Every structure is written in structure tokens, then in C-alpha cells.
Amino acid sequence: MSQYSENIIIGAGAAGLFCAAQLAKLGKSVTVFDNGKKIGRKILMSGGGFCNFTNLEVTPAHYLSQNPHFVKSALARYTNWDFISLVAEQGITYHEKELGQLFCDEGAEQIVEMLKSECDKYGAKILLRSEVSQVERIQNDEKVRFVLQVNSTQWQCKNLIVATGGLSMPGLGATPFGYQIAEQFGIPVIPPRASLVPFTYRETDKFLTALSGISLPVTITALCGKSFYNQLLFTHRGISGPAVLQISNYWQPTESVEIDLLPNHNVEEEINQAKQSSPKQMLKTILVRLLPKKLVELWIEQGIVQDEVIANISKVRVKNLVDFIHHWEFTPNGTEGYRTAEVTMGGVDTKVISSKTMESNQVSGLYFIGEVLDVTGWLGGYNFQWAWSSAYACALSISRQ
């Protein structure tokens, strides 16, 4: 057996499925291989089961990359609105959760269903339980530029689109195959790291484990200056939540994070209003009215915060408390693994890839789309949008040959 398909796609995920659909729709033959048992396994998990498919405010600045000028082209070619429009026209209902985030009303199944439907509608063939391996480059054959082993059959193609994703969720089928193919052809890869992931506590902060389950709004600021205002969640392992997941993109191993527990109010102003309006009251009572009761109690049960009458508090101790709550210098021991991480930072170096095409500069006929590229977006549907955009730029480019 020796099959052929002008276009082969490795990975039946967000980027793979969408690209396969665009190609069939533009009238090109394409086959998709996937080591998994079902298509779009991560799409089904995204957005807590409803799929945060994009965000109303998308710009290149919502993406992390060694190469800042990369993302702009594909994002402007196929926009968040081009997809929002495809979704609505496709009969899918969605709503805005917060911060421009858009989710499906009827679950992530809608997105996966729409993708699989477009592919069936235009001719794309999807083969599951097919793990790709042994990719070889062919040089003389004008019709065959690549050969590869899928199970026991050898496939041949003119264009090979790599949409294998990143490393998070290994139990879901995640593979480094995309990087392995790149490295085999001498294509540079930026060292991958788990991102949009929780932080783990060092020994000195382990006592905060007692706060597990508690949640509050804070502002997290990374050493590079980036800030995010959102919810922070105390865990058994460390700290998590939207604010933490967001800042893990800008945080670097060995680095510290600046956490403001009371971003909202101006503690001193308040502590003073209570110093006049309640000279009798305890510090603990004024504090619990601002922060979670159990956190305030823990600082006390740890002797970190003295509980005295508002009146018996020197203006200097009031200013040390204020700085203490607004400037918590947190140094995580590290990050949780790829089993919790939402994405993977790093990947194929985007400077050797085409900004307009997604095609490899070093190896013609080889394309990289999706998360495998060194393009990581913010939490909030940005990662899926990059998948739609890069998959489209690739398909549109190939249809033009």
C-alpha cells in the first residue's frame, strides 16, 4: 500500500481541522491524520466545556513570541470577526462571558461539530487512530515532496501541513512530533515551556495551603512590567486562577511576581476613615470587610499581622500594612506541569516561517500552523483564534498554487 494526497495534515485539532476544511472548500484534496480516537479533543475541553473560541479585542500584542512582527499578517487576513461571522452564519449561538471572551451556549461540541461538518461537506478526509512517523523529504519528484509512515502504509504528498499542537495534556494525545519534524530538517525550535499554568509554593509559603479554595480579585505584575487584573485562587499546590494563568506567560523561571491583594481600594484612606469613624474597632474587623476572613485570620494566626485597636496603630505601622497588602512579592518555586498547563510557550521559530503563508523558508512545501509555532496567546480565546488564522493563511496560500 502506497497512498497519495496532494495535501496531508498532521493533527486533527483546532488548526488542523480548520485548515483541512478551508482547503477542501477552496477545492484542494487533503487528508488529515491524527494519533487520537476523536477529533478536536482539546476543543471539547476548552472554555470549561463550552469553548472560548475567540475574543472581541484581538491584536498582535495579545500574543507572546520571540518574533513580535510575526502574528500581525495572518490575524489581519482572517479576523476574529471573520470567524465570529462564520459561527453565527453557521447557526451557532454564543455570548460574551467577560473581557471580550466569547463562548458557545450549547457547548464546545458545536465548534467541533461545525468543523467536522465543513470537512465532510467539501471532501476533506479524516483518518483517526493514525500516528504519523518517519517523515522524509523527496527531492526530484515534482508531484511528491514528502513521504511519511502512517501505521503500516506509506503516504506521499506535495504539501505537508504540521498542526500537531503543543505539549500540554499528554494524556489527551499531545506530542512533540511537530518539533521533531522541525529539528530533523534543521528548522530552529524555541525551547518549549508550560504556560497559562498555576504556580507552586516554595517551602516558606506552604502555610498558605490552608487557604485552599479561597478566591479574590488582585493585580499581578510580572518583572517585565506586564500587569493583569483578575481573580486569584489559593490552591493546595500554590496559587492559580485567571490572574495567575495570565501572568505565567510573562513570568520567567527564577522570577518573582508582584501581587496586589487590594487593587480596588486605598487601604490607608480607609484605615483612616475607620480611625475616625471607629477608633474602638479591631484591625481584624476593618480588614475582613475588605479581604476574605480566612486570609486575614491566617495572617494573624501566623503573627504576620498584629490585631490591635484602630486607635493604637502608629501612622508608620499603617503605612507598612498598606505596602504589605498592595505589594506582596511572591516567588513561586516553579510551575505545575503540562498536565495542568493550558498551552505551551515556545515552538518552531517563527522567523524561519512565512508570516503570510505559514510555509517553511528552509523547506518548501512544509507548513506549520497552530500551537506548534512559537506563538502563545493570552487566556481568553486568543489561542484558538491564532489556530483559525494560521490555518486559513496556510490554506489560502496553497489554493493559490
Ligand X SMILES: Cc1cc2nc3c(=O)[nH]c(=O)nc-3n(C[C@H](O)[C@H](O)[C@H](O)COP(=O)(O)OP(=O)(O)OC[C@H]3O[C@@H](n4cnc5c(N)ncnc54)[C@H](O)[C@@H]3O)c2cc1C
Least Å from the CB of residue 101 to ligand X: 8
Residues 6+ apart with CB under 8 A from 96: 56, 102
Tell me if 374 contacts ligand X by CB under 6 A.
Answer: no
Among residues 64, 15, 12, 14, which one has the least CA distance to residue 346?
A: 64
CB 328 within 8 A of CB 259: yes
| DSSP string across 120-173 | HHHT-EEE-S--EEEEEE--S-SS--EEEEETTEEEEESEEEE----SS-GGGT
- Tally the C-alpha atoms within 13 A of residue 98's C-alpha that lie toward its C-beta: 6
Q: Which of residues 14-73 bind ligand X (CB under 6 A)?
A: 14-16, 33-36, 41-42, 45-47, 52
Among residues 282, 330, 333, 342, which one has the least CA distance to residue 306?
A: 282
Closer residue to ligand X (CB): 36 or 242 = 36
Least Å from the CB of residue 308 to ligand X: 46
- Return the number of other C-beta atoms located less than 10 Å from residue 390's C-beta: 33
CB 359 within 8 A of CB 397: yes
Q: Confirm whether residue 41 is marked as ligand binding.
A: yes
Least Å from the CB of residue 164 to ligand X: 4
Among residues 379, 369, 343, which one has the least CA distance to residue 55?
A: 379
Tell me if 177 contacts ligand X by CB under 6 A.
Answer: yes
As given in the structure block, the three cell numbers for residue 270 are 480607609
Q: Confirm whether residue 384 is marked as ligand binding.
A: yes
Closer residue to ligand X (CB): 63 or 299 = 63
Which residue's CB comes closest to ligand X?
Answer: 13
Q: Which amino acid is at 298?
A: L
CB 375 within 8 A of CB 359: no
d(CA 218, CA 201): 18
Closer residue to ligand X (CB): 166 or 332 = 166
Least Å from the CB of residue 99 to ligand X: 12
Q: Confirm whether residue 334 is marked as ligand binding.
A: no
As given in the structure block, the three cell numbers for residue 317 are 505601622
Least Å from the CB of residue 14 to ligand X: 4
Q: Confirm whether residue 120 is marked as ligand binding.
A: no
Q: Which of residues 150-169 bind ligand X (CB under 6 A)?
A: 163-165, 168-169
Q: Which of residues 119-138 bind ligand X (CB under 6 A)?
A: 131-132
Least Å from the CB of residue 267 to ligand X: 35
d(CA 273, CA 370): 53
Stretch in the footprint of ligand X (CB under 6 A) among 6-14, 278-286, 307-315, 323-331:
6-14
Q: Confirm whether residue 34 is marked as ligand binding.
A: yes
Binding mask 202-241 for ligand X (x = CB under 6 A): ----------------------------------------
Stretch in the footprint of ligand X (CB under 6 A) among 88-96, 233-241, 298-306, 369-377:
369-377
Q: Confirm whether residue 372 is marked as ligand binding.
A: no
Least Å from the CB of residue 258 to ligand X: 26
Closer residue to ligand X (CB): 24 or 343 = 343
Q: How far is CA 112 from the centre of its chain?
A: 18
Tell me if 387 contacts ligand X by CB under 6 A.
Answer: yes
Total residues binding ligand X (CB under 6 A) = 37
d(CA 345, CA 338): 11
d(CA 6, CA 146): 10
Q: Is 255 strand, coil or helix?
A: coil
Q: Which amino acid is at 348?
A: V
Q: Report in angstroms the alpha-carbon separations of 352 from 33, 138, 216, 251.
A: 25, 20, 43, 26
Closer residue to ligand X (CB): 175 or 221 = 175
Tell me if 109 contacts ligand X by CB under 6 A.
Answer: no
Residues of the binding site: 15, 34-35, 41, 47, 52, 132, 371, 384
Residues of the binding site for FAD: 15, 34-35, 41, 47, 52, 132, 371, 384
Q: Which residues bind ligand X (CB under 6 A)?
A: 10-16, 33-36, 41-42, 45-47, 52, 131-132, 163-165, 168-169, 173, 175, 177, 342-343, 370-372, 381-384, 387
